[PDB]
Design an enzyme around this catalytic site. Structure first.
Site, PDB file in Angstrom:
ATOM      1  N   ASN A   1      30.738  18.017 -67.168  1.00  0.00           N
ATOM      2  CA  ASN A   1      29.721  17.439 -66.260  1.00  0.00           C
ATOM      3  C   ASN A   1      28.711  18.522 -65.859  1.00  0.00           C
ATOM      4  OD1 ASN A   1      28.486  15.230 -64.916  1.00  0.00           O
ATOM      5  ND2 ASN A   1      29.313  15.980 -62.953  1.00  0.00           N
TER       6      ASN A   1
ATOM      7  N   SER B   1      37.134  14.324 -77.297  1.00  0.00           N
ATOM      8  CA  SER B   1      36.738  13.413 -78.378  1.00  0.00           C
ATOM      9  C   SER B   1      36.851  14.011 -79.752  1.00  0.00           C
ATOM     10  CB  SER B   1      35.267  13.005 -78.225  1.00  0.00           C
ATOM     11  OG  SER B   1      35.211  12.089 -77.145  1.00  0.00           O
TER      12      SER B   1
ATOM     13  N   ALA C   1      31.634   6.597 -63.591  1.00  0.00           N
ATOM     14  CA  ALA C   1      30.304   6.516 -62.983  1.00  0.00           C
ATOM     15  C   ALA C   1      30.114   7.582 -61.910  1.00  0.00           C
ATOM     16  CB  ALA C   1      30.106   5.172 -62.352  1.00  0.00           C
TER      17      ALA C   1
ATOM     18  N   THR D   1      34.277  16.223 -74.772  1.00  0.00           N
ATOM     19  CA  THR D   1      33.915  16.426 -73.342  1.00  0.00           C
ATOM     20  C   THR D   1      34.809  15.881 -72.200  1.00  0.00           C
ATOM     21  OG1 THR D   1      32.658  14.363 -73.316  1.00  0.00           O
ATOM     22  CG2 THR D   1      31.462  16.338 -73.899  1.00  0.00           C
TER      23      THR D   1
HETATM   24  C1  LIG Z   1      34.867  12.651 -75.998  1.00  0.00           C
HETATM   25  O1  LIG Z   1      35.083  13.777 -75.668  1.00  0.00           O
HETATM   26  C2  LIG Z   1      34.159  11.588 -75.035  1.00  0.00           C
HETATM   27  N1  LIG Z   1      34.173  12.039 -73.731  1.00  0.00           N
HETATM   28  C3  LIG Z   1      34.641  11.404 -72.560  1.00  0.00           C
HETATM   29  O2  LIG Z   1      35.120  10.168 -72.924  1.00  0.00           O
HETATM   30  C4  LIG Z   1      34.615  11.870 -71.403  1.00  0.00           C
HETATM   31  C5  LIG Z   1      33.615  11.089 -70.365  1.00  0.00           C
HETATM   32  C6  LIG Z   1      33.327  11.559 -69.128  1.00  0.00           C
HETATM   33  C7  LIG Z   1      32.524  10.801 -68.293  1.00  0.00           C
HETATM   34  C8  LIG Z   1      31.906   9.659 -68.790  1.00  0.00           C
HETATM   35  C9  LIG Z   1      32.195   9.218 -70.075  1.00  0.00           C
HETATM   36  C10 LIG Z   1      33.069   9.940 -70.872  1.00  0.00           C
HETATM   37  C11 LIG Z   1      32.722  11.405 -75.595  1.00  0.00           C
HETATM   38  N2  LIG Z   1      32.186  12.679 -75.911  1.00  0.00           N
HETATM   39  C12 LIG Z   1      31.113  12.742 -76.161  1.00  0.00           C
HETATM   40  C13 LIG Z   1      30.557  14.056 -76.662  1.00  0.00           C
HETATM   41  O3  LIG Z   1      31.329  14.842 -77.229  1.00  0.00           O
HETATM   42  O4  LIG Z   1      29.379  14.442 -76.526  1.00  0.00           O
HETATM   43  C14 LIG Z   1      30.011  11.482 -76.058  1.00  0.00           C
HETATM   44  C15 LIG Z   1      28.608  11.759 -76.409  1.00  0.00           C
HETATM   45  C16 LIG Z   1      28.137  11.922 -74.997  1.00  0.00           C
HETATM   46  C17 LIG Z   1      26.680  11.732 -74.669  1.00  0.00           C
HETATM   47  N3  LIG Z   1      25.847  12.575 -75.539  1.00  0.00           N
HETATM   48  C18 LIG Z   1      24.454  12.361 -75.579  1.00  0.00           C
HETATM   49  O5  LIG Z   1      24.197  11.524 -74.691  1.00  0.00           O
HETATM   50  C19 LIG Z   1      23.931  13.266 -76.681  1.00  0.00           C
HETATM   51  C20 LIG Z   1      22.448  12.967 -76.984  1.00  0.00           C
HETATM   52  C21 LIG Z   1      22.007  13.901 -78.155  1.00  0.00           C
HETATM   53  N4  LIG Z   1      20.584  13.934 -78.375  1.00  0.00           N
HETATM   54  C22 LIG Z   1      19.609  14.794 -77.977  1.00  0.00           C
HETATM   55  C23 LIG Z   1      18.553  15.217 -79.005  1.00  0.00           C
HETATM   56  O6  LIG Z   1      19.174  14.699 -76.842  1.00  0.00           O
HETATM   57  C24 LIG Z   1      22.589  15.300 -77.790  1.00  0.00           C
HETATM   58  O7  LIG Z   1      22.425  15.697 -76.610  1.00  0.00           O
HETATM   59  O8  LIG Z   1      23.177  15.900 -78.717  1.00  0.00           O
HETATM   60  C25 LIG Z   1      26.692  12.005 -73.190  1.00  0.00           C
HETATM   61  O9  LIG Z   1      27.169  11.231 -72.370  1.00  0.00           O
HETATM   62  N5  LIG Z   1      26.152  13.216 -72.744  1.00  0.00           N
HETATM   63  C26 LIG Z   1      26.387  13.585 -71.343  1.00  0.00           C
HETATM   64  C27 LIG Z   1      25.474  14.788 -71.089  1.00  0.00           C
HETATM   65  C28 LIG Z   1      27.839  13.899 -71.156  1.00  0.00           C
HETATM   66  O10 LIG Z   1      28.513  14.296 -72.043  1.00  0.00           O
HETATM   67  N6  LIG Z   1      28.246  13.641 -69.852  1.00  0.00           N
HETATM   68  C29 LIG Z   1      29.567  14.062 -69.438  1.00  0.00           C
HETATM   69  C30 LIG Z   1      29.891  13.705 -67.976  1.00  0.00           C
HETATM   70  C31 LIG Z   1      29.708  15.564 -69.362  1.00  0.00           C
HETATM   71  O11 LIG Z   1      28.690  16.278 -69.488  1.00  0.00           O
HETATM   72  O12 LIG Z   1      30.837  15.968 -69.100  1.00  0.00           O
HETATM   73  C32 LIG Z   1      30.353  10.266 -75.608  1.00  0.00           C
HETATM   74  S1  LIG Z   1      31.845  10.332 -74.547  1.00  0.00           S
END
Ligand SMILES: *C(=O)[C@@H](NC(=O)Cc1ccccc1)[C@@H]1NC(C(=O)O)=C(CC[C@H](NC(=O)CC[C@@H](NC(C)=O)C(=O)O)C(=O)N[C@H](C)C(=O)N[C@H](C)C(=O)O)CS1
Length: 346
Positions: free
Chosen positions: A326, A61, A120, A300
């Site tokens: 993940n 991203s 999912a 991510t």
């Molecule tokens: C860009 O890279 C894009 N990623 C994808 O599209 C891959 C993907 C994989 C599986 C499902 C969906 C998408 C986006 N990237 C990002 C990012 O860079 O972080 C997104 C933001 C993701 C979410 N972040 C939070 O939920 C952050 C909350 C915030 N607040 C605090 C105080 O708690 C923080 O933590 O900073 C998100 O989904 N997070 C989870 C943990 C996540 O990233 N899950 C995937 C599976 C992983 O860990 O790989 C949106 S998508």
């Protein structure tokens, strides 16, 4: 007037990330012309080849900041108005004419994020799309099977769909592929020799870190996720780069090299995410513990966690990569590189 970067603290962050399941982790700091570079672990866990800060990787991203820079240069050129409806440029695309370009670029459009359905189940979802080629319209149609989740402009809700729209806008308004626009507007002028957009090719050119997808089952074997089309993301996620090139890119952005002052100001109009984070136009702000804010983006994509952030004037930039995804423990640990790099020793 920044604190010195803390290399011992950086070293501890990488070591912790390995202990939590990253095969390899690394970080590069460009501190006003002085480089810091650290890595630990493996680029390829099966062969044992060590990771290094010159390894190319999938930035995920972080791609949205490249897409946003192209769009904002189109605003500078008079080709795009951020407050015009998406549907004025792409008639019939979205079910609401009130959704504007500015709203899509700041994740305030309400458009449902299709990637939640796709991924999912982490590994089955990866296996389902890794070798698929989608059009931009295919992905928008997947979003639009669901209703919007909020009224136009009303709330922050991250959605990859927004930067799929961005790519469609770029290609319609320029008549060129996003690859061409990235190359001509960003990669060539900044001499980003490690940066590529090769979609739908699955090969990462040159020496690279392999990506390792963590399964949803705790303790489960890692999946090599290095080679995929990234066609499910495209202008939301498919750039390949390096720590040196993302440092160059975000330093150039913040120091005013990539657009007019007026458009950089638009890019930094923050939508609140939480008490320590904002979202601009394809750009994140993070507020660090020592009272410094930094600017850039996270990524991510399967098997790769990226942080790439710079100070307000661009003089210090940091890019960190762990070659897993993940794995929330790893994700949270790698954020600590920004503390060590910008705030320094406690
Ligand atoms: C860009 O890279 C894009 N990623 C994808 O599209 C891959 C993907 C994989 C599986 C499902 C969906 C998408 C986006 N990237 C990002 C990012 O860079 O972080 C997104 C933001 C993701 C979410 N972040 C939070 O939920 C952050 C909350 C915030 N607040 C605090 C105080 O708690 C923080 O933590 O900073 C998100 O989904 N997070 C989870 C943990 C996540 O990233 N899950 C995937 C599976 C992983 O860990 O790989 C949106 S998508």
């Amino acid at each position: 007037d920044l604190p010195a970067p803390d290399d011992t603290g950086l070293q501890a962050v990488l070591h912790t990330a390995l202990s939590q399941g990253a095969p390899g982790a690394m970080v590069r700091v460009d501190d006003n012309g002085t480089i810091h570079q650290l890595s630990e672990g493996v680029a390829d866990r099966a062969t044992g080849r060590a990771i290094t800060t010159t390894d190319r990787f999938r930035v995920g991203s972080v791609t949205k900041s490249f897409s946003a820079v192209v769009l904002l240069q189109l605003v500078d050129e008079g080709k795009l108005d951020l407050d015009a409806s998406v549907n004025t440029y792409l008639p019939g695309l979205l079910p609401d004419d009130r959704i504007t370009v500015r709203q899509v670029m700041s994740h305030r459009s309400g458009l449902y994020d299709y990637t939640n359905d796709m991924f999912a189940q982490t590994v089955p979802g990866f296996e389902s799309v890794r070798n698929k080629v989608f059009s931009y319209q295919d992905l928008i149609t997947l979003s639009l099977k669901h209703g919007v989740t909020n009224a136009p402009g009303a709330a922050y809700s991250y959605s990859n769909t927004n930067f799929v729209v961005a790519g469609m806008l770029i290609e319609k308004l320029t008549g060129h592929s996003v690859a061409t626009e990235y190359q001509n507007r960003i990669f060539t002028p900044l001499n980003l020799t490690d940066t590529f957009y090769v979609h739908p090719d699955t090969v990462i050119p040159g020496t690279h870190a392999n990506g390792y997808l963590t399964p949803d089952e705790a303790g489960g074997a890692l999946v090599d996720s290095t080679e995929q089309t990234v066609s499910w993301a495209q202008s939301a996620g498919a750039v390949i780069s390096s720590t040196q090139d993302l440092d160059t890119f975000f330093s150039a952005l913040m120091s005013g090299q990539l657009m007019s002052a007026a458009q950089l100001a638009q890019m930094q109009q923050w939508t609140t995410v939480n008490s320590t984070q904002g979202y601009g136009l394809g750009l994140r702000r993070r507020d660090l513990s020592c009272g410094i804010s930094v600017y850039g983006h996270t990524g991510t994509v399967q098997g790769y966690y990226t942080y790439a952030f710079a100070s307000k004037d661009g003089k210090r930039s940091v890019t960190a990569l762990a070659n897993t995804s993940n794995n929330v423990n790893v994700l949270n640990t790698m954020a600590r590189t920004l503390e060590s790099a910008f705030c320094g020793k406690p």
